[PDB]
């Protein structure tokens, strides 16, 4: 899929130098249409479904008259000039091979803005952990197995979106980059938004990738579900990762289940005592009500690891369609350092997997 | 304070009845105006302040033209209506006792419509039970509490507004009613709103009163912000209970966060573990940054309970403004039951009355 891409000038002879050098010298990655008419231009968008229009600086365009996913960008003559009535601008007399990657981050930026969660296999897998039962340790397993399948040799990245989400206790790296930075990137309607979050990236000791926690708290309340859908599939868009690991709160509100729903594979986790298990059937009675609805589809994507489970006390729930793929003990007097490192040698991560 | 009603009717032989012996034989209680008049009824109820407006059934009366909380009823001859225009309908024929009961009834209904928390020293004390920190054991400790404070003598009552809450784990009762009864007519505007609610009041074997679970767990979704304040409103306008346990989630949302505020004590419970530490001092950080919105004060109102606290594995939190109050251990291989009745017996609970 090459990228289409509209010109829009009163210079011909600029419009075709350019329209020359990018339908020879890359006709592989580009087509190019060169207007001098800015009506002309603006319905051959629609019409020739172009992805990038490139308009000289006086115009004034309107990019609601696309009617489609296309991006803006301006050229001018000034140098030192990032944007131009909020668009990249894009210096005329650079070399060419420049102008090419600008149109490719004006592309790029128009794609990241409307980025979802890809089920494609081309794309990285998404697995979510959530749980009804509070503190069995799906945080820790969820860890647990993002450095589990790291040690695999897979490209993984980690994703928490709790409040009091722990994930400097579990990664360390270097770097002042955050959560809140994502966020901000995420809620400025502005351009680089793939590059600002890649730079936002952080690798664990272990090879995990991840955003570490927001500076405070409250700025994880900032990020809506269609913000964590964009982030997703912008990590996705990334094409580095095998497999996104993602912490998130369990509630039966409709929203958080479609977001859910969205997931590849859900991983719950539960200790199999009294109040654990009567809240996973609690949650798993309204989730199959609220499979009534077309975008929810849950139940048949999860698997159970049982976390803390005691051969005593805890005892597993019996005549339910969700697969149990394996079981952790309650670890004694254990750091969460040693905790997390009994549970990387557990063999049913692999099975998450597969 | 006594109630102010207004009487309009063409009958002036029924209105000078009514108020002649409402004006004395219930002149400690009532106040009664009347009129023949509409425009002179309604702009009486700003002046006079009137509580229950009371007009003949041939009226249209629009009630938003009260300008302020006020009951409105409907005389009729017409005997086995229950309401007339969407509102209480008072038999004309009657007698008097009856129809002053009515008149009450719909003070209260509007009164009951209104109902926020109070702080007032007669009202029942609301205290909050709530945690970050999952799994600690809050819900078990607030029902532990609930039984200690019940075993002293104390009239309590139980609210637990956890989607997957686990009340009927703890209480059971004789009786069909269910927290859904109560969410639907805290939904339906509708009258008899209290004594509505007061149906759906069950008690434990020990002596807790309590709304029990909702028939499905979604539910709950359904109560909003302002219906849990005009509940515990409403359980304090019963002039019964000492004292109203309430289990809520935590979270940083604002209006989590005002409502946690109206509590007259916070009960935050921490098992003392490295994540639990963390995930604490995480929240406070961002409710003191909260705090400086007005209808925000927390910290103030929170004391600590230590629960599951490993001797060899816990470690309290030092340098922070929370009085912790007490201490329980993780009981080895304990039922749900067992862990509550080690519970109650914990003097700490009553600090929480004091
Ligand atoms: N296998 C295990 N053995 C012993 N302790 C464990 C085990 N797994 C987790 N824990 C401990 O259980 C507690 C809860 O862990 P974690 O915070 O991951 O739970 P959670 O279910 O994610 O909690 P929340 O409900 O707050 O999300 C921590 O103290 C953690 O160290
Ligand atoms: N003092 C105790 N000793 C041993 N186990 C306990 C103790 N208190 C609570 N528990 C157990 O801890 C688990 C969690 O209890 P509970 O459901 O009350 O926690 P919670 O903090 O309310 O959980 P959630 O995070 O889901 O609200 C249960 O298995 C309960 O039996
Ligand atoms: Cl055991
Ligand atoms: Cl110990
Ligand atoms: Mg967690
Ligand atoms: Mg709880």
């Known amino acids: 899929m090459k990228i289409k891409v509209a010109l829009l000038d009163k210079d011909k002879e600029y419009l075709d130098r350019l329209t020359g050098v990018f339908n020879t010298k890359y006709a592989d990655k580009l087509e190019v249409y060169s207007f001098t008419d800015e009506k002309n231009a603006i319905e ?16 004034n365009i309107d990019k609601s008259e696309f009617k489609r996913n296309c991006g803006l960008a301006y050229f001018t003559g000034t140098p030192g000039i990032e944007l131009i009535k909020d668009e990249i601008a894009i210096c005329k007399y650079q070399r060419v091979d420049v102008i090419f990657k600008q149109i490719l981050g004006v592309y790029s930026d128009m794609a990241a803005n409307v980025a979802t969660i890809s089920g494609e296999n081309d794309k ?3 697995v979510i952990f959530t749980s009804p039962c509070g503190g069995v340790g799906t945080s820790t397993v969820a860890a647990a197995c993002a450095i589990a399948h790291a040690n695999m040799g897979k490209k993984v990245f980690y994703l928490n979106i709790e409040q009091c989400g722990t994930t400097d206790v579990f990664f360390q790296a270097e770097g002042n980059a ?11 309607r502005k351009a680089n938004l793939l590059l600002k979050l890649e730079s936002c990236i952080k690798q664990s000791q272990e090879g995990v990738s991840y955003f570490s926690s927001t500076k405070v ?14 982030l997703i599939g912008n990590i996705q868009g990334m094409d580095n990762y095998d497999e996104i ?8 509100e409709i929203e ?4 859910l729903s969205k997931a590849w594979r859900i991983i719950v986790v539960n200790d199999g005592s009294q109040l654990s298990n009567y809240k996973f059937m609690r949650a798993y009675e309204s989730v199959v009500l609220l499979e009534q609805n077309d975008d929810i589809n849950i139940i ?3 698997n159970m690891i049982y976390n803390k489970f005691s051969n005593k006390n805890s005892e597993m729930l019996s005549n339910i369609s969700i697969k149990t793929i394996g079981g952790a003990p309650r670890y004694e007097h254990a750091t969460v350092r040693q905790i997390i490192e009994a549970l990387t040698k557990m063999e049913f991560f692999e099975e998450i997997l597969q």
Chains 1, 2 share one sequence.
């Open 44 to 59: 051959s968008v629609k019409e020739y479904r172009i992805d990038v229009l490139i308009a000289e600086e006086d115009f």
């Open 124 to 126: 990285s897998s998404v």
């Open 178 to 188: 955050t959560m809140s930075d994502v966020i901000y990137s995420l809620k400025s």
């Open 217 to 230: 708290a409250l700025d994880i309340l900032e990020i809506s579900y269609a913000d964590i859908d964009t």
């Open 245 to 252: 690991i993602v912490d998130l709160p369990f509630s039966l």
């Open 256 to 259: 958080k289940l479609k977001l």
């Open 300 to 302: 048949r994507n999860m």
